[PDB]
Design an enzyme around this catalytic site. Structure first.
Site, short mmCIF file in Angstrom:
data_model
loop_
_atom_site.label_atom_id
_atom_site.label_comp_id
_atom_site.label_asym_id
_atom_site.label_seq_id
_atom_site.Cartn_x
_atom_site.Cartn_y
_atom_site.Cartn_z
N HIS A 271 0.82 -1.21 0.00
CA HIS A 271 0.00 0.00 0.00
C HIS A 271 0.85 1.26 0.00
CE1 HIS A 271 -2.77 -2.94 1.81
NE2 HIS A 271 -3.70 -2.27 1.16
N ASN B 213 -3.34 2.16 -5.79
CA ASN B 213 -2.78 2.46 -4.51
C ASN B 213 -1.72 1.42 -4.05
OD1 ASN B 213 -2.63 4.10 -2.11
ND2 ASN B 213 -3.76 2.44 -1.04
#
Ligand SMILES: [Mg+2]
Length: 240
Positions: free
Chosen positions: A85, A106
Site C-alpha cells: 500500500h 494504490n
C-alpha cells in the site's frame, strides 16, 4: 468538497487530472502503471483495524494504464515483493470508500523486507500521532522514486516500472507553515530490521528526485524556508 492535502496537492505529476476519493487523492502514471503520489488525511475517525485485502483494478482508470490482480502472479517468488500500500489501509479504512485502498492504483511491488519492516513501523507511528489529544489531523503525501531498474513483474506483458524507493512527507493539524513536519525516504533494499528514524530527509530532496512540488499551495517564502530543513515531527514519533 474533499481536500486530502490542506496546503495544495502536489504539482508535477505525469497526469494532469488526479483521482479524488475520501480515502486519498492519487495521481496516476500511465507509463509506470503506478501512482506518482498519493495524498491522505488521517483523523480520529479514519483508522479501522482488521479490514481484508481484495485487490482490484481501479475502475476509475483505463485498464491499460494501471495493473490488474493477475499482473502480480509470481512476483513474490521472482522479486521478493509484496503488494504494498501507498495510502495505508489500517489508518484510513474507516472512510466511506475504504475498499479503494485495495485498488491497485494504490499498490506497488514493494520489497517484502521494506513493507513488513521499516515502512510498517513508520505507518504505525504515523497512525499513533492521531491518538494525541492535540493532534486533530495528519496530512501525508507518499510516493515512489524511479531511479534504477528493479526488474519486471513476470506475470504481465504490460510495460511498467517498479519503484526503486519510497518516500513519505507528513505534517500535523493545519499546515507545515506553522506545524511540525517530517519526510522519510527508503530504498527498496532497506533491511527488514531497519529503524525508520534513520531515513529522515528533506522535502526538497524528495522534490528533486521526483519532479514534484509537494505542498504546492504554500507561499514561496515558506516553501523556500522549510523544505530544505529537516523537520521535528519525527521526535514525536519516537525518534531520538
Ligand atoms: Mg504495507
Amino acid at each position: 468538497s474533499i481536500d486530502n492535502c490542506a496546503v495544495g496537492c502536489p504539482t508535477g505529476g505525469s497526469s494532469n487530472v488526479s483521482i479524488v476519493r475520501h480515502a486519498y487523492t492519487l495521481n496516476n502514471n500511465s507509463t509506470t502503471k503506478f501512482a506518482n503520489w498519493v495524498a491522505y488525511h488521517i483523523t480520529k475517525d479514519t483508522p479501522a483495524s482488521g479490514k481484508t485485502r481484495n485487490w482490484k483494478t481501479d475502475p476509475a482508470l483505463n485498464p491499460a494504464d494501471t495493473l490488474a490482480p493477475a499482473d502480480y502472479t509470481g512476483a513474490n517468488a521472482a522479486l521478493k515483493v509484496d503488494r504494498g500500500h501507498q495510502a495505508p489501509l489500517a489508518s484510513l479504512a474507516g472512510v466511506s470508500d475504504w475498499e479503494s485502498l485495495n485498488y491497485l492504483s494504490n499498490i506497488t511491488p514493494q520489497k517484502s523486507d521494506l513493507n513488513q519492516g521499516a515502512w510498517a513501523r513508520l505507518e504505525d507511528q504515523e497512525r499513533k500521532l492521531i491518538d494525541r489529544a492535540d493532534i486533530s489531523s495528519v496530512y501525508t503525501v507518499t510516493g515512489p522514486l524511479y531511479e534504477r531498474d528493479m526488474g519486471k513483474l513476470p506475470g504481465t506483458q504490460k510495460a511498467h516500472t517498479i519503484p526503486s524507493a519510497y518516500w513519505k512527507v507528513i505534517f500535523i493539524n493545519n499546515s507545515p507553515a506553522v506545524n511540525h513536519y517530517a519526510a522519510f525516504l527508503f530504498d527498496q533494499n532497506t533491511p527488514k530490521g531497519a529503524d525508520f528514524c534513520q531515513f529522515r530527509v528533506t522535502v526538497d530532496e524528495i522534490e528533486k528526485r521526483t519532479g514534484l512540488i509537494i505542498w504546492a499551495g504554500l507561499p514561496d517564502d515558506v516553501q523556500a524556508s522549510l523544505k530544505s530543513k529537516p523537520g521535528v515531527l519525527p521526535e514525536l514519533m519516537g525518534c531520538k
